[PDB]
Amino acid sequence: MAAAVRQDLAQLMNSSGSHKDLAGKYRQILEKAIQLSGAEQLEALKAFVEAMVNENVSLVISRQLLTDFCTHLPNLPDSTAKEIYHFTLEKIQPRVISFEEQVASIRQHLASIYEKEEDWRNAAQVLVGIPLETGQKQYNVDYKLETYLKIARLYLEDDDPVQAEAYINRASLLQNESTNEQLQIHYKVCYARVLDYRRKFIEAAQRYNELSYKTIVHESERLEALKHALHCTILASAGQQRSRMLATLFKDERCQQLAAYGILEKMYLDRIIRGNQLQEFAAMLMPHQK
Amino acid sequence: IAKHVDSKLRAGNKEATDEELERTLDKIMILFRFIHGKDVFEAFYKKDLAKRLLVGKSASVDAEKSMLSKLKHECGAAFTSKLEGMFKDMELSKDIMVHFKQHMQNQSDSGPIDLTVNILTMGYWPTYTPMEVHLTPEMIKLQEVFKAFYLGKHSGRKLQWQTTLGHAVLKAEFKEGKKEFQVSLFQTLVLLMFNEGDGFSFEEIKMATGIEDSELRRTLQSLACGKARVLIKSPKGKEVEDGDKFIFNGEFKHKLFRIKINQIQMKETFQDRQYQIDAAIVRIMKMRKTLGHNLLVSELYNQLKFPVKPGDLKKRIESLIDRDYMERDNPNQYHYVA
Amino acid sequence: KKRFEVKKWNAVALWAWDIVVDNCAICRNHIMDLCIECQANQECTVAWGVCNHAFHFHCISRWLKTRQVCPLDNREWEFQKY
Amino acid sequence: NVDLENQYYNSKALKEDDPKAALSSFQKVLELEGEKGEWGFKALKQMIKINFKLTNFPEMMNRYKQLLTYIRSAVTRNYSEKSINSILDYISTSKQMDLLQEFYETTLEALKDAKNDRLWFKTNTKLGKLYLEREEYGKLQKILRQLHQSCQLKKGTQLLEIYALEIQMYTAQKNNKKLKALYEQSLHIKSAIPHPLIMGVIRECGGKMHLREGEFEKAHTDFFEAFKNYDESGSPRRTTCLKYLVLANMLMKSGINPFDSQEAKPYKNDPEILAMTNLVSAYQNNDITEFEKILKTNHSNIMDDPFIREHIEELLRNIRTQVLIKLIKPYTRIHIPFISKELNIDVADVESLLVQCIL
Ligand SMILES: [Zn+2]
Ligand SMILES: [Zn+2]
Ligand SMILES: [Zn+2]
């Protein structure tokens, strides 16, 4: 029943000895407060968050306390962690400039929770709140690319192709110059998925075919990409580019193991396909392709 | 050579003059019109204009735009380019500051500090990223308020602040006499963060303020040394190491009620490519005999892999047309002429 | 009472575009993916201008082949950067 | 002598006793100083502001006279112009136009006594703008004539400013021919460094005149220049300029989305521009049904000004012509009622459109 200890924090503010003593007192009071488990603990964290934003405490000590509190923080049940995450996110709003980077980290953690809570709607909104571009503090290229790819994937899983396309365009605006290797492959995968979702089937098939020749990617994912390219080029609008792509896939010996080889045979030679033939081909199509 | 006209255009109190200043400016242009190598003069004048307008104020914008207009003649509208942009940026900064003052006086009129912004354009000015130093909480409110106001006025612009090219005034309260300081951002931050507490070590300054080590060393080089009375220290000249115990003396007997320690401004610290371009120009010709200038530039850009700047294109075209390799009646077309 | 208090503060800032370029006005495709005909035919990069509009290179050359006018601002097109 | 200049600071520091003590303190600031310098300029001003705060017009009038004879030399032209503009604005914020008029008259006469130059030019320009605020024409016209005589080339800024003022007056006086003549005259100046507000003002009128006459390429160029120069200077006219640019682009046969430019993309979601954005997106990628739906839904917000309504007849006909051309392309002998069904118009309109297209 150590509820009053948070009020003791006020008595820490009266000290005028501006040195490591205040940092140690804050660290030890945080250590004492985190030992609780009930709603008293939730009130404790709350009070701590609403006291950290106070202007009386110096910027450096408050920043250090906030950052180590966040870095040790998330070891609680998910519900209380989400509640306190929302509380601190809405509380640090008046002083975002002085508490920028910390807030960013917190937001990322919140998105992580929505990754395991099966919520692709609010996860994108939470990840958007991070000021990647605006702000006196700028991040590296890799962080921006990873955040944009995560947002694009999250929006894609929510059946919102417009926002996914916008954020993949934002990512590609800076993807050209980068040092990471797997990030380029992930960006190509996300762009191909976005093009597939936007019903640009021939471009998606071209991107998937180009992706299938990559050596870093695993063989199983290569076969999956080839299957996706075949499905996209079968659904693509009839024409000359589609026929050229069909010939290109036909000249590949890996199409035999694919389940849609017969349709490829009947389409490459320009033969009319009966209605009953596509009875089983439409079963393997993606839900958004029907 | 442009240093003379920069000093003549600089603010100098008694240097203030009359229409004969315009006559002397015309005389300077008379000496300039027959001088070759205009690129160096233009670059030096751009640097001088940036120095005069970005930090501090010049003698008068009158003669400034008069000189810009005079250089527009005999050179071309596209040749001047940037300087007109700097002038327009200064005008926009003045207008935006007036509007922000009106807005601040209108709603929640408190005015803790007097902000003065000088918003510039990314391209024209010789910009440079700041140290990303953490600003003390007294000036964060005005930064947020002006950012909100600018976003409300202009949509989708984003402000890229520079905390290395500004000034401020601090009302010192050491003892009797409010010695109004005039400091740069680094010194403002150091003094303000030292205000809460006493005797912070150099590593404490690095942690609390976040200035880069070299810039912080340069800043703490001042506030002492000169006149050996701003701060009394046993070492002289330069001696600063990690863990140094330094504290401002609790008295300031500087014998003038106008303190300016922002003295940092005073104590401030192809042949192969040209051959390839000429060969490309020749190869584009002896084929397309009559060709436009933009078409020729695009053709050379297509035929080359490395980027190359358009200035190289223009200078090589001029050099090789000087050698009677082409001839110039449209002014944007070239015949082969061998 | 503050030993140092800020009375006035003159700061120098900059403005930019939070989103510079997304599509070529000519081909309506992405700026940095491919120049539409380059996709059907099969590196080529963007070509800026004095007005800083940054079309493609094949697209701007095709436009210049007919008329020497910038598509958007309708000014004289002078090449800059590559 | 550092005491003399810095004692203004410690006399402005004991500014708690403004009445009968600040006046005396700055009075002895003047009397203890003989060197013509900026510090006396600061003194005058300070007491001018303090005195005008506590009424007492004649003393501040005399202090005006002292300041105006102080503007001859010593202080920089930039600071003197800034102080004159600041004092004029800080009084004009309280109206009381008669003492403002004597203010402007004294500035004009004093700057006539000294060199006039751009300082007197801009003082008279500000007086003309103040007259324009009242929309009265006689005083504005006479001030404009005085200004034009003073101007009457290496000084194109002055001509551009006076032409902008003339265009601003005549756009309220409703004189189309005068506006066209003034725009044609101002087209000659090519070596000026003006404020972007002036450039936008002189370009918007030219774009409107081109739109009225029938030209569309020059109208589009002028409207783009006006919008670009109106954005920067803040301005609350950027919108209508963007709407006019969109309309001119649509009347240009377009083929290129005007919202793909970096200078107009952020405004594509403005509440006053959304209807025009939808109209443009419907125009290209021909869709008559979507165009009609947008026109009917937004029939009360954009169908008010007499500039889009009069050009809506040119539209709804180019789009129909393009749809007809793209529809009759693969056929060789096509029924006319089929075309009427496709275009959602009666047979007579289809026949008239076909006859006009063939002719
Ligand atoms: Zn393009
Ligand atoms: Zn290409
Ligand atoms: Zn352009």
Give the position of tokens 């300031």: B252
Angstroms from B193 CA to nearest CA on chain A? 9
Query: What CA–CA distance (Å, rounded) separates D359 from D356?
Result: 5
Q: Classify the C-alpha dihedral A43-A44-A47-A49 as positive or negative.
A: negative
In this structure, are residues A207 and A195 in contact, taking their beta carbons and an 8 Å threshold? yes
Nearest in space to D81 (alpha carbons), one of D113, D116, D30: D116
Angstroms from D118 CA to nearest CA on chain B? 7
Q: Which residues pair with D55 in a beta bridge?
A: none
> Which residue from C19, C28, C53 is facing D261, i.e. has the nearest CB?
C53
DSSP state of D79: H
Q: Is B72's Cβ below 8 Å from some Cβ in D?
A: yes
Please measure the distance between the N-terminal and C-terminal CA atoms of chain B and give it in whole angstroms.
40
> Which residue from A169, A176, A203 is facing C22, i.e. has the nearest CB?
A169
> Which residue from C12, C64, C82 is facing B162, i.e. has the nearest CB?
C12
Q: b/e for A60-87, b at 16 or more Cβ within 10 A? A: bbbbbbbeebbeebeebeeeebbebbee
Touching subunits of D (3+ CB pairs, under 8 Å) are B, C
- Distance of CA A24 to CAs A51, A64, B198, B313, D247, Å? 16, 11, 19, 65, 67
Copy the structure tokens of residue B9: 């255009």
Closest Cα in chain D to C21? D262
In this structure, are residues D173 and D189 in contact, taking their beta carbons and an 8 Å threshold? no
Nearest in space to A194 (alpha carbons), one of A224, A155, A140: A155
The amino acid present at A87, given as its one-letter code, is F
Which residue out of C14, C53, C68 would a mutagenesis test of the B interface target, given it has the greatest number of B Cβ atoms within 10 Å?
C14
In this structure, are residues B127 and B173 in contact, taking their beta carbons and an 8 Å threshold? no
Angstroms from C19 CA to nearest CA on chain B? 8
Q: Is B92's Cβ below 8 Å from some Cβ in D?
A: yes
Query: What CA–CA distance (Å, rounded) separates B119 from B159?
Result: 8
Query: What CA–CA distance (Å, rounded) separates D323 from D353?
Result: 12
Chains B and A touch (3+ CB pairs under 8 A): yes
In this structure, are residues D229 and D203 in contact, taking their beta carbons and an 8 Å threshold? yes
Give the position of tokens 């990512």: A171
Domains by residue range for chain C, with CATH? 1-82 (3.30.40.10)
Nearest in space to A197 (alpha carbons), one of A278, A82, A67, A289: A289
Query: What CA–CA distance (Å, rounded) separates D269 from B160?
Result: 24
Contact B137 A55 (CB under 8 A): yes
Query: What CA–CA distance (Å, rounded) separates B101 from C32?
Result: 42
Contacts of D333 (CB under 8 A, 6+ apart): none
Closest Cα in chain D to B120? D232
Contact A97 B207 (CB under 8 A): no
Q: Is D193's Cβ below 8 Å from some Cβ in B?
A: yes
Contacts of A187 (CB under 8 A, 6+ apart): A145, A149, A168, A171, A172, A175
Give the position of tokens 């205000």: B195
Resolution of the structure in the document, Å: 3.4
Copy the structure tokens of residue A11: 């008595």
DSSP state of B333: E
For residue B166, what is the enclosing H or E element?
A: strand B162-171
Strands B120-121 and C14-15: parallel
Give the position of tokens 């705060």: D53
Give the position of tokens 């990069």: C45
Contacts of C59 (CB under 8 A, 6+ apart): C24, C26, C27, C35, C36
Contact C81 B168 (CB under 8 A): no
In this structure, are residues A187 and A194 in contact, taking their beta carbons and an 8 Å threshold? no
For residue D255, what is the enclosing H or E element?
A: none
Query: What CA–CA distance (Å, rounded) separates B276 from B274?
Result: 5
Q: Is A241's Cβ below 8 Å from some Cβ in C?
A: yes
Contacts of C9 (CB under 8 A, 6+ apart): B113, B114, B115, B116, B139, B142, B166, B167, B168, B169, B188
Q: What's the alpha-carbon Rg for chain A, to the nearest Å?
A: 27
Q: Which burial class, exposed, middle or buried, applies to D325 when counting CB atoms under 10 A from its CB (0-12, 13-18, 19+)? A: exposed
Q: b/e for B135-156, b at 16 or more Cβ within 10 A? A: bbebbbebbebbbebbeeebee
- The binding site of C comprises 24, 27, 35, 38, 44, 51, 53, 56, 58-59, 70, 73
| DSSP one-letter string for D259-275 | GGSTTTGGGGG-TTTHH
Three-state secondary structure of chain D: CHHHHHHHHHHHHCCCCHHHHHHHHHHHHHHCCCCCCHHHHHHHHHHHHHHHHCCCHHHHHHHHHHHHHHCCCCCCHHHHHHHHHHHHHHHHCCCCHHHHHHHHHHHHHHHHHCCCHHHHHHHHHHHHHHHHHHCCCHHHHHHHHHHHHHHCCCCHHHHHHHHHHHHHHHHHHCCHHHHHHHHHHHCCCCCCCCCHHHHHHHHHHHHHHHHHHCCCHHHHHHHHHHHHHHHHCCCCCHHHHHHHHHHHHHHCCCCCCHHHCCCCHHHHHCCCCHHHHHHHHHHCCCCHHHHHHHHHHCCCCCCCCCCCCCCCCCCCCHHHHHHHHHHCCCCCCCCHHHHHHHHCCCHHHHHHHHHHHHC
Which residue out of C15, C69, C72, C77 would a mutagenesis test of the D interface target, given it has the greatest number of D Cβ atoms within 10 Å?
C72
Strands B162-171 and B120-121: unpaired
Q: What's the alpha-carbon Rg for chain B, to the nearest Å?
A: 27
Q: Which burial class, exposed, middle or buried, applies to D166 when counting CB atoms under 10 A from its CB (0-12, 13-18, 19+)? A: buried
Helix, strand, coil proportions of chain A in percent (round to 5)? 70, 0, 30
Copy the structure tokens of residue D95: 């109206």
DSSP state of C55: B
Query: What CA–CA distance (Å, rounded) separates D319 from D292?
Result: 11
Copy the structure tokens of residue D261: 């430019």
Question: From chain B, which residues contact A within 8 Å (Cβ)?
Answer: 130, 132, 134-137, 140, 143-144, 158, 161, 196-198, 207-208
Crossing angle, helix B82-106 and helix B38-54, to 10 degrees? 10
Closest Cα in chain D to B119? D232
> Which residue from C18, C32, C40 is facing A176, i.e. has the nearest CB?
C32
